[PDB]
Amino acid sequence: ASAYQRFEPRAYLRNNYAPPRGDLCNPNGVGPWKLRCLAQTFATGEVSGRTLIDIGSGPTVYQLLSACSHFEDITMTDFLEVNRQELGRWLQEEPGAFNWSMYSQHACLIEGKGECWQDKERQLRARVKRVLPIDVHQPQPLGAGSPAPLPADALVSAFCLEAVSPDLASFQRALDHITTLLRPGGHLLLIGALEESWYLAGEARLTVVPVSEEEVREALVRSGYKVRDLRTYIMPAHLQTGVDDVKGVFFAWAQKV
C-alpha cells in the first residue's frame, strides 16, 4: 500500500494509455475492445439510474465516456491525492491535463449516435460532480458522512481491486466493501487485469494479486451479484511492453441481487 505513495500519475498514463496500448486505430487493440465492452453494455439500456460512482478512478476518465450519458450525478474517486489532482486538471480543463480526445472520439465512433467528441467530454465534465478520496479496504470506503449520494444506482471500477489487494481474500473483501455503496438491483461494471502480479508506475512498483476469470466470477457471486456478462481480452505479444506482466483483461457486468 505504502508503495502507492511513490505512484506517478503521468508515468502510469504513459505506460497504459499512450501508444502502443493507447493506440485506438487498430480494432483488435485493448483500447478499442475496452470501450466497446462499456458502450455495448450501456446501449442495452438496462444499466440506468441517477447516480454512479467510479471506484479508484486514478487519473483516467475513459471508463465513464459511454456511461456519463446515462447518469446525471457522477462521483469519481481515488485513494491518492495526486490522482484526484490530475483528474481535476482534466475536469477543469486546466493546463497540463491529460489528453483524452482520441478516446472520446472513439467512444463517439463506437456508440454511433452521430455525436461530436466535444459534446461527449462536455457532458462528462458536466455530470461529474465530485472527486472524492476513497479506500476500498475500509468497510465504508468513502467514510462516515460522504458528499456522495448513497446508495448509488450503479458502480464502475477499472483495475482497482486486484491492484490494491495482496491476495484473493483481500480482493474478496474489498469487493464486499464497495458492494455496500450499491443500491439493491443496482449494476456493477468491473474491469481488471487477469493473472497480473506487478506493474510499474514510475518509481512505484505495485504488487498485484493474480486473478483468473473464474476467480473473478466466483468472487462476484460470493458478494451477492448476478453475473450478467463476463468477457476476456488476451493481451497480445506486441502490447507486452515491460511495464507489467498482465496476461489479459476482463470485463464484468454484474447486478447486485
Ligand X SMILES: Nc1ncnc2c1ncn2[C@@H]1O[C@H](CSCC[C@H](N)C(=O)O)[C@@H](O)[C@H]1O
Out of 244, 251, 253, 254, name the contact with ligand TMJ by CB under 6 A.
244
Collapsed DSSP state (helix, strand, coil) of residue 102: helix
Residue 135 near which of ligand TMJ, ligand X, none (CB within 5-8 Å, type-dependent)? ligand X
Does position 209 bind ligand TMJ by CB under 6 A? no
> How far lies 15's CA from each of 113, 235, 240, in Å?
31, 14, 11
User: C-beta of 67: minimal distance to ligand X in Å?
Assistant: 13
C-alpha cell at 191: 474491469
- The 33-72 contact track toward ligand TMJ, x by CB under 6 A, reads -xx--------------------------x----------
User: C-beta of 17: minimal distance to ligand TMJ in Å?
Assistant: 5
Judge whether 73 is annotated as a binding position.
no
Q: What is the 3-state secondary structure (H, E, C) of 175-208?
A: HHHHHHHEEEEEEEEEEEEECCCEEEECCEEEEC
Does position 120 bind ligand TMJ by CB under 6 A? no
Does position 30 bind ligand TMJ by CB under 6 A? yes
User: C-beta of 207: minimal distance to ligand TMJ in Å?
Assistant: 11
User: C-beta of 105: minimal distance to ligand TMJ in Å?
Assistant: 12
Judge whether 4 is annotated as a binding position.
no
Judge whether 62 is annotated as a binding position.
yes
How many other CB atoms are there within 10 angstroms of residue 81's CB atom?
A: 9
- State the pairing for strand pair 51-55/73-78: parallel
Q: Which residues contact 194 (CB under 8 A, 6 or more apart)?
A: 210, 211, 212, 213, 216, 232, 246, 247, 248, 249, 250
Does position 79 bind ligand TMJ by CB under 6 A? no
Instruction: Please provide residue 25's backbone torsions phi and psi, each rounded to the nearest 5 degrees.
Output: -70, -40
Does position 22 bind ligand TMJ by CB under 6 A? yes
User: C-beta of 114: minimal distance to ligand X in Å?
Assistant: 27
Q: Which residues contact 15 (CB under 8 A, 6 or more apart)?
A: 21, 199, 200, 201, 241, 243, 244
Q: Is the dihedral of CA 159, 248, 34, 255 positive or negative?
A: negative
Instruction: Tell me whether residue 170 or residue 180 sits nearer to ligand TMJ (CB atom).
Output: 170
Does position 246 bind ligand TMJ by CB under 6 A? yes
Element (H, E) at 233: strand 225-234
Give the residue among 170, 173, 126, 134 at the shortest CA–CA distance from 152. Answer: 134
User: C-beta of 147: minimal distance to ligand TMJ in Å?
Assistant: 27
Residues of this chain that interact with ligand X (CB under 6 A) are: 4, 7, 56-58, 60, 63, 78-80, 83, 134-137, 158-160, 163-164
Binding residues for S-adenosyl-L-methionine, by number, are 12, 17, 56-57, 62, 78, 83, 135-136, 158
Q: Where along the sequence are the contacts to ligand TMJ (CB under 6 A)?
A: 16-17, 21-22, 30-31, 34-35, 62, 159, 163, 193, 196, 199, 244, 246, 249
